């Protein structure tokens with residue numbers, strides 16, 4: 001007995017490589033004054049939470065704090081051009097503000113398509129047919145701060161980043177969809193990342209990953225702020241979403 | 257308590273309504289090409305959704321006002337006895353817009369009609385939009401159109417399903433129908449009644465993206481790959497087990 005090359009309704013990505021793969025985390029807390037963007041207190045909690053969860057799944061995690069755009073591009077270009085032949089998959093997380101198709105680095109914005117395009121096709125042959133998962137916590141920075149050089153609070157940011165797709169075997173995960181609001185607690189971190197990390201810890205090692213993202217959708221969409229603490233946060237619901245171009249089931253069973 | 261495997265309750269008296277808006281021809285002033293093969297798509301979809309328990313309603317070449325009127329009428333009736341709601345658009349599109357016969361309509365206007373405040377009886381139920389719409393180029397022939405419609409998200413418990421993502425190309429056979437719709441219907445027929453629906457959509461991703469573009473009867477279409485996508489805001493597992 002063997003498996004003939006017949007359409008399998010339950011096909012899974014092969015997750016038996018020597019290594020799980022790299023998980024990149026781009027963490028942005030502060031921005032060049034000329035961008036007139038507010039700080040993102042709580043993002044370091046998000047970064048740490050993610051590092052622990054992804055590391056327990058076998059990923060090699062690399063974090064970068066407050067990179068300038070050129071440095072960021074350089075770093076991601078460097079990761080895209082090495083061999084991922086011995087890896088199962090690739091994860092890239094952006095924790096920043098954003099606008100439309102753009103994510104903000106420290107000093108400038110970068111087009112998302114530019115970042116994902118580095119891992120397409122034969123630009124990165126050794127990731128072809130492997131899951132390429134981008135996780136994006138980025139929304140509109142509230143701008144009631146000046147264009148001049150300069151306790152757990154929940155900050156509420158309007159969705160601003162387009163929920164773009166990205167190519168075969170890409171999975172694009174967004175903290176929030178158009179019309180909704182992203183929330184970040186200044187000590188505990190983002191609603192989305194907290195709930196993502198909690199599900200990863202509890203179910204990451206067995207649950208099909210888009211099914212886990214669906215759990216995150218439910219958890220986040222059911223959260224309520226105070227109403228005593230911020231009353232105008234009243235009514236600003238958060239609905240995450242994910243755009244999948246995956247072609248197989250994705251699991252993170254513990255590597256043998 | 258929290259259930260990691262919770263499913264939408266698909267227990268209601270009826271499965272629900274599946275609306276199909278089918279556009280084959282457009283008013284001359286729009287200068288859009290005909291969509292031969294779309295009638296096969298309409299028929300294929302009707303059979304699949306009907307076998308899944310859906311009350312299917314098809315409308316061919318409605319003008320924008322008629323289309324808006326019809327979908328508003330559907331959004332304002334009670335879906336209290338229904339499991340869910342499906343809406344399919346077969347047309348050309350651009351950005352945020354899908355073409356009716358005479359004019360374009362914003363997708364957000366269409367999905368907004370079924371958001372919780374506007375449609376109480378669908379709150380907490382899957383609302384599934386399937387969109388075969390790309391850029392109209394201005395015996396079985398394969399037509400190849402550039403992706404043009406933004407892969408928009410919609411609200412909680414919406415699932416937005418797109419024939420093609422930015423950078424890729426949608427294909428339609430004049431006799432057999434669209435690649436995306438053909439593969440979707442094929443999967444619906446074999447696995448619709450058992451497989452979790454986003455897992456089924458993943459199969460469709462695989463099926464469409466593996467269709468070779470190496471040797472086209474039209475050398476111009478060589479290398480113009482199709483990759484679909486879906487944007488999920490579902491909050492539970494979705495199955496269409498026989499009612």
Ligand SMILES: O=c1[nH]c(N2CCCC2)cc2ccccc12
Nearest residue numbers: 162163164165352406407408409
């Ligand atoms: O490219 C996109 N543009 C836009 N917009 C440009 C016009 C305003 C929205 C929205 C979107 C959403 C999901 C996926 C892609 C897109």
